[PDB]
Amino acid sequence: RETFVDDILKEIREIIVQMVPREAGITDVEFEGPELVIYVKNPEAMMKDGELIKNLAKVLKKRISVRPDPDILLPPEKAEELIKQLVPPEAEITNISFDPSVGEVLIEARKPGLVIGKNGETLRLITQKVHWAPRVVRTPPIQSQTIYSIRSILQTESKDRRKFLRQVGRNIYRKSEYKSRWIRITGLGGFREVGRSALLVQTDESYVLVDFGVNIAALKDPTKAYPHFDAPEFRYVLDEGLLDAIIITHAALDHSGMLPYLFRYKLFDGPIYTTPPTRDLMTLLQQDFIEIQHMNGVEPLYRPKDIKEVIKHTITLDYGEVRDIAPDIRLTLHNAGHILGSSIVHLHIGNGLHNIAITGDFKFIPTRLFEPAVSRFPRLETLVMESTYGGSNDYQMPREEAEKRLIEVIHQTLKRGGKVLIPAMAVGRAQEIMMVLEEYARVGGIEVPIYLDGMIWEATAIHTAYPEYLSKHIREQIFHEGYNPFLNPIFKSVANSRERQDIIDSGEPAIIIATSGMLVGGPSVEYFKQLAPDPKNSIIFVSYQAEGTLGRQVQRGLREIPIVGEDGRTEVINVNMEVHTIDGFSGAADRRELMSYVARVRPRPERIITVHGEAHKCLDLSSSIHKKFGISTRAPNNLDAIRLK
Amino acid sequence: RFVRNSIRPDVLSERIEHALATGSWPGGRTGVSQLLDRTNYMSTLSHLRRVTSPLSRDQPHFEARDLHGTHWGRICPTETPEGPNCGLVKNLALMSQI
Amino acid sequence: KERACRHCHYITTEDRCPVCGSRDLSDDWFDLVIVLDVESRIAKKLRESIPEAAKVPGKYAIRVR
Amino acid sequence: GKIFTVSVTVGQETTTANLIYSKAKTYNLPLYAILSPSKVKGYIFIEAPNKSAVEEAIRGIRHAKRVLPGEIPFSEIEHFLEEKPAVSGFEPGDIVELIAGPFKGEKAKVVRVDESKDEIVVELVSSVVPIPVTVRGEYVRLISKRQ
RNA sequence: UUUUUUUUUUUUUUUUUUUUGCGCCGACC
DNA sequence: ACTGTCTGGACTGGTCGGCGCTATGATC
DNA sequence: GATCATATTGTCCAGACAGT
Ligand SMILES: [Zn+2]
Ligand SMILES: [Zn+2]
């Protein structure tokens, strides 16, 4: 297609040289994804204060990234020494990396606030005295394998990443601010159903795909496990390569499971806009899904190299940051409160033409982990909302008495010397349970160790890596105070099977948080097998148990369960332990929460689309909203296109 | 400049170095150059005064392995190796001149 | 780069076409044909396939794309 | 004259043909014509009255190995000079292999064939869901022919 | 003043525990 | 039926240690 | 200045065999 990126770049350069003083020495101006990069020979005059950069960003309506000229670059050892001397010793810098190709130094520090500065003046001071553009990322207190691998992949593929970013920036700004003639919303999946979500945003200029996911419940049937690839609009977009970007709401298999499949068969080549916690958690979940599919004997959906390609094609966006991802579409992300890095996708199509907010999975009540979902937007016309708990009789129990019952059950179990086994998801409810247990044990209620097995430790490390995405209480504790709730010594990690055997054989009371809520794999099955005959122990279920799983069999009240032994003979598990079920820790919004979010959203949307739930639940939610507030509501099926404007 | 830039000394240097290091001379010859024996003063002189034969060690060369009457004053009559090298690996006499 | 004419299938290194003076040259071509004699058998075979080919000895292309 | 084969290095037939043509032009070799199809790898066709002229032309070039001792009938190389689309000769329903493109080393089934745009639509056989893709005709290679 | 088409309900989770080879040379029994 | 000729093969076991050797030319 | 296809095709004993 025809592009006018060169004319836009020339106009931007003319505006810059009109505004920026001549002593700066501007050499090259280019686009790197959704941000503008300016190369100068005198960084001292360019950024003596933040007012000039702020004025340039306000005038150009772009994210300005000032970088020094590659010709004026200090030696890496002298640059490292100068950076270490300039940064205060309170901020413990761990790793410093340099990019010879483009002026940029990556600084890994335990306290990025001191490296950045009170108002960013420390970054300007560093890039002035050292002539190296600084990029600061947080070193987690708990080491994370996924984050280290992602950072190593990004650093080792700098040339490919820069080429991809330049191509994305050229494609995004192919033309200036364009008013779309029409806006179309089509659902390739997740409409009147749970899982395999897929939302396509179509205009006359650009196309946007939102939370491309997969279905695990119907994995046996290919017609229901994956989004509708037979849609004529999706086929036209993929065949012609017109997909501008893909945005993932949050890191779950029903929202990001099908992402590596596109890169496996080279069906996509553009960028992916997720928050860094969402990217890390979705990479971990995709790797676990691939490993599980491999272990089950079925053909894996994709390969780890496809996940690496997804990592290489991912652009990280923070909360509240407005970026241009299309000639007519502006994308910003807001907190959702469901899981770590969960974002509500807000799309600003045109210059005030229309606004779409896709909430996805979200929570509107305050929690121990994350702040409630953002209900305030600069402009809102169409709202897309989940309907997982959209039924009239769907009313989840409040959090405080559920956690009180959990605490009292755990205390009763530990009073008699038993062991508490809590099967849980890899992300979500497990971290909330750990936070509740840490709060209870901080007053001296319990002294027994808490053991995390499987992906719980990795998810905890990822949570520690991004404390700004957590709730206000945890943020205040970590930043204002010196206390980190996740760094409690009670939380212990078991390395191998020998440590698990020692934990099981030990007579001292302990709390074990496994990584399989249904007891279908992982260390949860072994823990249940080795702790079931003991009557002093107890098992607490914090999630719904699907039919046909071992966890549902234990929850229903089966005293004995026949299983296949190691030698090939049937084995009988005597479940003499206590069984408890507390389903009050669900991260999904309640029906009352959904109604409150509809009532308290500002501004009031013109129409509301109910998706991500069962068909009768979605219809009930839409009818209730229409009857209570008078807003027009629709619950379309799959392959349904709605013309918003 | 055109002639000078077209000459690569590395090929000749590497060929000579490899032949002198491995001992494999061009034409199928092997064992031409060996590591100098530094066990004592006698071994180095004996190796520097060593004469070998191109015949195969496994074949019995009865007419070639035995001491010849023309070896008087040219080839040492007593210093010979044991085994397959007996009579085929010789040493120069102290009065010998080449 | 070497580009081939869309009319006479002639590969030239300049904008001007020394055979028909065409301004539309293609940078993608396969099966290079070198003609040194006009009365060659393969030149005669190419003449009945493409009328404008093999008029002047030189480089030629079987197809233009 | 007579068609002769010259064995050359694979992937560098065009440069060897150009060098042979330049040498024949400069030194007035009795060479009639040179044909170097792109599909044939490592071999070129030179038309000369006798194989001695070919041997004298190709000598002195490191990349010209030897001349095949035989004469090719013109009917064998007649189809090379004719211009035919790469899409033509392909029918839907068979299995093809994609030599080049983003789908390198992948087997696919032909779905739609159109000779107007010189493109062929294929469906990957290893994909869990059918996703038709458009690829160039010359990029594919016919593995089997069924329907 | 005119021929030859047909028609309806049963398969569940958003995921899991240690340099091989090649050849040469010298030497011992 | 004899007789000289062509071709294939195996070349005593073990042990000691050393000394090299395992890419290159042509675009982009 | 970095990468990519290609990179060539020692005597003697015993059994089988043309020659007269
Ligand atoms: Zn979801
Ligand atoms: Zn022409």
PDB file of C-alpha atoms in Angstrom, chain A residues 233-416:
ATOM      1  CA  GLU A 233     -12.357 -11.077   7.258  1.00  0.00           C
ATOM      2  CA  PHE A 234      -9.672 -12.881   9.272  1.00  0.00           C
ATOM      3  CA  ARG A 235      -8.587 -14.845   6.192  1.00  0.00           C
ATOM      4  CA  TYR A 236      -8.326 -11.624   4.172  1.00  0.00           C
ATOM      5  CA  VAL A 237      -6.341  -9.933   6.952  1.00  0.00           C
ATOM      6  CA  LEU A 238      -3.918 -12.841   7.406  1.00  0.00           C
ATOM      7  CA  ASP A 239      -3.430 -13.570   3.694  1.00  0.00           C
ATOM      8  CA  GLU A 240      -2.664  -9.938   2.817  1.00  0.00           C
ATOM      9  CA  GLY A 241      -0.668  -9.299   6.003  1.00  0.00           C
ATOM     10  CA  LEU A 242      -2.867  -6.380   7.084  1.00  0.00           C
ATOM     11  CA  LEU A 243      -2.864  -7.208  10.816  1.00  0.00           C
ATOM     12  CA  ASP A 244      -1.381  -4.088  12.401  1.00  0.00           C
ATOM     13  CA  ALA A 245      -0.997  -5.341  15.975  1.00  0.00           C
ATOM     14  CA  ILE A 246      -2.114  -7.905  18.548  1.00  0.00           C
ATOM     15  CA  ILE A 247      -2.988  -6.898  22.124  1.00  0.00           C
ATOM     16  CA  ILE A 248      -3.308  -9.407  24.978  1.00  0.00           C
ATOM     17  CA  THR A 249      -5.556  -8.418  27.881  1.00  0.00           C
ATOM     18  CA  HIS A 250      -3.913 -10.702  30.447  1.00  0.00           C
ATOM     19  CA  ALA A 251      -1.701 -13.781  30.659  1.00  0.00           C
ATOM     20  CA  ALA A 252      -4.074 -16.734  30.456  1.00  0.00           C
ATOM     21  CA  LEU A 253      -4.413 -19.629  28.027  1.00  0.00           C
ATOM     22  CA  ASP A 254      -7.888 -18.492  26.954  1.00  0.00           C
ATOM     23  CA  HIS A 255      -6.420 -15.088  26.014  1.00  0.00           C
ATOM     24  CA  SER A 256      -2.856 -15.886  24.861  1.00  0.00           C
ATOM     25  CA  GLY A 257      -2.808 -19.620  24.091  1.00  0.00           C
ATOM     26  CA  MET A 258      -2.973 -19.311  20.296  1.00  0.00           C
ATOM     27  CA  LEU A 259      -0.365 -16.532  20.019  1.00  0.00           C
ATOM     28  CA  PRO A 260       2.698 -18.744  19.235  1.00  0.00           C
ATOM     29  CA  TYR A 261       0.679 -20.685  16.639  1.00  0.00           C
ATOM     30  CA  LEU A 262       0.618 -17.658  14.325  1.00  0.00           C
ATOM     31  CA  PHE A 263       4.411 -17.346  14.490  1.00  0.00           C
ATOM     32  CA  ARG A 264       4.843 -21.115  14.079  1.00  0.00           C
ATOM     33  CA  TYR A 265       3.424 -20.990  10.532  1.00  0.00           C
ATOM     34  CA  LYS A 266       4.627 -17.417   9.797  1.00  0.00           C
ATOM     35  CA  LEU A 267       1.058 -16.101   9.723  1.00  0.00           C
ATOM     36  CA  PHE A 268       1.991 -12.940  11.658  1.00  0.00           C
ATOM     37  CA  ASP A 269       4.964 -10.584  11.635  1.00  0.00           C
ATOM     38  CA  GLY A 270       3.818  -7.480  13.534  1.00  0.00           C
ATOM     39  CA  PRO A 271       4.164  -6.425  17.166  1.00  0.00           C
ATOM     40  CA  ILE A 272       2.419  -7.621  20.318  1.00  0.00           C
ATOM     41  CA  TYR A 273       1.441  -5.034  22.944  1.00  0.00           C
ATOM     42  CA  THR A 274       1.332  -6.552  26.439  1.00  0.00           C
ATOM     43  CA  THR A 275       2.484  -5.430  29.857  1.00  0.00           C
ATOM     44  CA  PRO A 276       5.831  -6.972  30.930  1.00  0.00           C
ATOM     45  CA  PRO A 277       4.183  -9.057  33.698  1.00  0.00           C
ATOM     46  CA  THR A 278       1.649 -10.284  31.142  1.00  0.00           C
ATOM     47  CA  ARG A 279       4.445 -11.172  28.713  1.00  0.00           C
ATOM     48  CA  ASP A 280       6.462 -13.083  31.322  1.00  0.00           C
ATOM     49  CA  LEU A 281       3.470 -14.943  32.764  1.00  0.00           C
ATOM     50  CA  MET A 282       2.104 -15.822  29.319  1.00  0.00           C
ATOM     51  CA  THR A 283       5.503 -17.154  28.227  1.00  0.00           C
ATOM     52  CA  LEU A 284       5.663 -19.306  31.366  1.00  0.00           C
ATOM     53  CA  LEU A 285       2.104 -20.558  30.824  1.00  0.00           C
ATOM     54  CA  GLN A 286       2.727 -21.308  27.136  1.00  0.00           C
ATOM     55  CA  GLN A 287       5.895 -23.240  27.996  1.00  0.00           C
ATOM     56  CA  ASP A 288       3.990 -25.226  30.631  1.00  0.00           C
ATOM     57  CA  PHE A 289       1.167 -25.928  28.163  1.00  0.00           C
ATOM     58  CA  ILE A 290       3.642 -27.155  25.534  1.00  0.00           C
ATOM     59  CA  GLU A 291       5.385 -29.368  28.103  1.00  0.00           C
ATOM     60  CA  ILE A 292       2.044 -30.796  29.270  1.00  0.00           C
ATOM     61  CA  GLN A 293       0.944 -31.535  25.698  1.00  0.00           C
ATOM     62  CA  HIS A 294       4.297 -33.216  25.033  1.00  0.00           C
ATOM     63  CA  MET A 295       4.035 -35.323  28.200  1.00  0.00           C
ATOM     64  CA  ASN A 296       0.456 -36.385  27.407  1.00  0.00           C
ATOM     65  CA  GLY A 297       1.689 -37.964  24.158  1.00  0.00           C
ATOM     66  CA  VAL A 298      -0.367 -35.711  21.865  1.00  0.00           C
ATOM     67  CA  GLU A 299       1.189 -33.531  19.176  1.00  0.00           C
ATOM     68  CA  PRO A 300       2.268 -30.168  20.655  1.00  0.00           C
ATOM     69  CA  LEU A 301       0.506 -27.101  19.292  1.00  0.00           C
ATOM     70  CA  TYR A 302       3.763 -25.187  18.767  1.00  0.00           C
ATOM     71  CA  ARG A 303       7.441 -25.149  19.768  1.00  0.00           C
ATOM     72  CA  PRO A 304       9.550 -23.153  22.253  1.00  0.00           C
ATOM     73  CA  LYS A 305      11.163 -21.352  19.304  1.00  0.00           C
ATOM     74  CA  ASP A 306       7.705 -19.983  18.488  1.00  0.00           C
ATOM     75  CA  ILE A 307       7.493 -18.648  22.052  1.00  0.00           C
ATOM     76  CA  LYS A 308      10.928 -17.086  21.523  1.00  0.00           C
ATOM     77  CA  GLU A 309       9.637 -15.454  18.328  1.00  0.00           C
ATOM     78  CA  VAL A 310       6.639 -14.163  20.300  1.00  0.00           C
ATOM     79  CA  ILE A 311       9.078 -12.677  22.826  1.00  0.00           C
ATOM     80  CA  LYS A 312      11.080 -11.046  20.021  1.00  0.00           C
ATOM     81  CA  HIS A 313       7.867  -9.543  18.571  1.00  0.00           C
ATOM     82  CA  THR A 314       6.482  -8.154  21.850  1.00  0.00           C
ATOM     83  CA  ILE A 315       6.439  -4.446  22.738  1.00  0.00           C
ATOM     84  CA  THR A 316       5.985  -3.691  26.436  1.00  0.00           C
ATOM     85  CA  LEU A 317       3.532  -0.997  27.547  1.00  0.00           C
ATOM     86  CA  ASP A 318       2.897   0.240  31.080  1.00  0.00           C
ATOM     87  CA  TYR A 319      -0.361   1.336  32.700  1.00  0.00           C
ATOM     88  CA  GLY A 320      -1.727   4.668  31.513  1.00  0.00           C
ATOM     89  CA  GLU A 321       0.765   5.031  28.649  1.00  0.00           C
ATOM     90  CA  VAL A 322      -0.814   6.197  25.385  1.00  0.00           C
ATOM     91  CA  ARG A 323       0.913   4.860  22.268  1.00  0.00           C
ATOM     92  CA  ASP A 324       0.084   5.022  18.563  1.00  0.00           C
ATOM     93  CA  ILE A 325      -0.220   1.465  17.225  1.00  0.00           C
ATOM     94  CA  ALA A 326      -2.032   2.383  13.990  1.00  0.00           C
ATOM     95  CA  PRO A 327      -2.578   5.448  11.769  1.00  0.00           C
ATOM     96  CA  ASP A 328      -6.072   5.868  13.258  1.00  0.00           C
ATOM     97  CA  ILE A 329      -6.014   3.779  16.473  1.00  0.00           C
ATOM     98  CA  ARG A 330      -4.451   4.827  19.785  1.00  0.00           C
ATOM     99  CA  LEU A 331      -3.974   2.183  22.484  1.00  0.00           C
ATOM    100  CA  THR A 332      -3.712   2.639  26.250  1.00  0.00           C
ATOM    101  CA  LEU A 333      -3.766   0.095  29.075  1.00  0.00           C
ATOM    102  CA  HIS A 334      -5.424   0.369  32.488  1.00  0.00           C
ATOM    103  CA  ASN A 335      -5.360  -1.844  35.565  1.00  0.00           C
ATOM    104  CA  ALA A 336      -7.868  -4.709  35.625  1.00  0.00           C
ATOM    105  CA  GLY A 337      -7.195  -6.354  38.997  1.00  0.00           C
ATOM    106  CA  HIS A 338      -7.660  -9.948  37.822  1.00  0.00           C
ATOM    107  CA  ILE A 339      -4.040 -11.182  37.852  1.00  0.00           C
ATOM    108  CA  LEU A 340      -0.572  -9.653  37.698  1.00  0.00           C
ATOM    109  CA  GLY A 341      -0.251  -7.459  34.627  1.00  0.00           C
ATOM    110  CA  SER A 342      -3.936  -7.791  33.724  1.00  0.00           C
ATOM    111  CA  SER A 343      -4.875  -4.818  31.558  1.00  0.00           C
ATOM    112  CA  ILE A 344      -8.132  -3.335  30.294  1.00  0.00           C
ATOM    113  CA  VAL A 345      -7.663  -2.558  26.603  1.00  0.00           C
ATOM    114  CA  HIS A 346      -8.845   0.943  25.674  1.00  0.00           C
ATOM    115  CA  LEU A 347      -8.808   1.826  21.970  1.00  0.00           C
ATOM    116  CA  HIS A 348      -9.041   5.437  20.767  1.00  0.00           C
ATOM    117  CA  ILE A 349      -9.955   5.121  17.088  1.00  0.00           C
ATOM    118  CA  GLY A 350      -9.614   8.388  15.192  1.00  0.00           C
ATOM    119  CA  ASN A 351      -9.344  11.884  16.623  1.00  0.00           C
ATOM    120  CA  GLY A 352     -12.274  11.458  18.976  1.00  0.00           C
ATOM    121  CA  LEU A 353     -14.341   9.414  16.517  1.00  0.00           C
ATOM    122  CA  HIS A 354     -14.948   6.422  18.798  1.00  0.00           C
ATOM    123  CA  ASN A 355     -13.637   4.759  21.949  1.00  0.00           C
ATOM    124  CA  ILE A 356     -13.725   1.039  22.782  1.00  0.00           C
ATOM    125  CA  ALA A 357     -12.871  -0.452  26.181  1.00  0.00           C
ATOM    126  CA  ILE A 358     -12.344  -4.221  26.383  1.00  0.00           C
ATOM    127  CA  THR A 359     -12.248  -5.159  30.061  1.00  0.00           C
ATOM    128  CA  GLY A 360     -11.724  -8.900  29.757  1.00  0.00           C
ATOM    129  CA  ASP A 361     -11.218 -10.648  33.072  1.00  0.00           C
ATOM    130  CA  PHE A 362     -11.264  -8.052  35.845  1.00  0.00           C
ATOM    131  CA  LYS A 363     -12.174  -7.436  39.481  1.00  0.00           C
ATOM    132  CA  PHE A 364     -13.919  -4.341  40.834  1.00  0.00           C
ATOM    133  CA  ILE A 365     -13.525  -4.963  44.587  1.00  0.00           C
ATOM    134  CA  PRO A 366     -10.239  -4.267  46.420  1.00  0.00           C
ATOM    135  CA  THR A 367      -8.083  -7.340  46.996  1.00  0.00           C
ATOM    136  CA  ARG A 368      -4.921  -8.206  48.897  1.00  0.00           C
ATOM    137  CA  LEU A 369      -2.929  -8.296  45.634  1.00  0.00           C
ATOM    138  CA  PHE A 370      -4.134  -5.681  43.133  1.00  0.00           C
ATOM    139  CA  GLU A 371      -6.117  -2.463  43.020  1.00  0.00           C
ATOM    140  CA  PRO A 372      -9.692  -2.549  41.672  1.00  0.00           C
ATOM    141  CA  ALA A 373     -10.284  -2.116  37.956  1.00  0.00           C
ATOM    142  CA  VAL A 374     -10.156   1.381  36.485  1.00  0.00           C
ATOM    143  CA  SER A 375     -13.684   2.675  35.855  1.00  0.00           C
ATOM    144  CA  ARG A 376     -12.686   6.171  34.660  1.00  0.00           C
ATOM    145  CA  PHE A 377     -11.730   6.912  31.053  1.00  0.00           C
ATOM    146  CA  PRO A 378     -11.227  10.170  29.125  1.00  0.00           C
ATOM    147  CA  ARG A 379     -13.915   9.043  26.663  1.00  0.00           C
ATOM    148  CA  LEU A 380     -16.008   5.890  26.340  1.00  0.00           C
ATOM    149  CA  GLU A 381     -18.650   4.897  23.788  1.00  0.00           C
ATOM    150  CA  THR A 382     -18.577   1.084  23.506  1.00  0.00           C
ATOM    151  CA  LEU A 383     -17.811  -1.261  26.407  1.00  0.00           C
ATOM    152  CA  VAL A 384     -16.873  -4.936  26.047  1.00  0.00           C
ATOM    153  CA  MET A 385     -17.308  -6.784  29.337  1.00  0.00           C
ATOM    154  CA  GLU A 386     -16.808 -10.323  30.586  1.00  0.00           C
ATOM    155  CA  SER A 387     -19.791 -12.402  31.709  1.00  0.00           C
ATOM    156  CA  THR A 388     -18.201 -15.313  33.572  1.00  0.00           C
ATOM    157  CA  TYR A 389     -20.435 -14.683  36.610  1.00  0.00           C
ATOM    158  CA  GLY A 390     -23.236 -12.885  34.777  1.00  0.00           C
ATOM    159  CA  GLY A 391     -26.015 -15.071  36.143  1.00  0.00           C
ATOM    160  CA  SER A 392     -28.725 -13.608  38.338  1.00  0.00           C
ATOM    161  CA  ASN A 393     -28.095 -16.142  41.123  1.00  0.00           C
ATOM    162  CA  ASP A 394     -24.292 -16.018  40.739  1.00  0.00           C
ATOM    163  CA  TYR A 395     -23.078 -14.417  43.984  1.00  0.00           C
ATOM    164  CA  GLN A 396     -19.575 -15.247  45.189  1.00  0.00           C
ATOM    165  CA  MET A 397     -19.040 -15.101  48.933  1.00  0.00           C
ATOM    166  CA  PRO A 398     -17.213 -12.078  50.397  1.00  0.00           C
ATOM    167  CA  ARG A 399     -13.476 -12.307  50.948  1.00  0.00           C
ATOM    168  CA  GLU A 400     -13.143 -11.563  54.665  1.00  0.00           C
ATOM    169  CA  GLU A 401     -15.090 -14.490  56.129  1.00  0.00           C
ATOM    170  CA  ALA A 402     -13.734 -16.862  53.468  1.00  0.00           C
ATOM    171  CA  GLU A 403     -10.185 -15.985  54.506  1.00  0.00           C
ATOM    172  CA  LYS A 404     -11.233 -16.188  58.170  1.00  0.00           C
ATOM    173  CA  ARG A 405     -12.525 -19.727  57.590  1.00  0.00           C
ATOM    174  CA  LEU A 406      -9.316 -20.635  55.747  1.00  0.00           C
ATOM    175  CA  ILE A 407      -7.206 -19.234  58.602  1.00  0.00           C
ATOM    176  CA  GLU A 408      -9.205 -21.063  61.274  1.00  0.00           C
ATOM    177  CA  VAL A 409      -9.109 -24.351  59.329  1.00  0.00           C
ATOM    178  CA  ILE A 410      -5.331 -24.046  58.920  1.00  0.00           C
ATOM    179  CA  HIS A 411      -4.939 -23.189  62.615  1.00  0.00           C
ATOM    180  CA  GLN A 412      -7.060 -26.190  63.628  1.00  0.00           C
ATOM    181  CA  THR A 413      -5.019 -28.479  61.367  1.00  0.00           C
ATOM    182  CA  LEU A 414      -1.703 -27.182  62.730  1.00  0.00           C
ATOM    183  CA  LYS A 415      -2.939 -27.399  66.334  1.00  0.00           C
ATOM    184  CA  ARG A 416      -3.117 -31.209  66.137  1.00  0.00           C
TER     185      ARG A 416
END
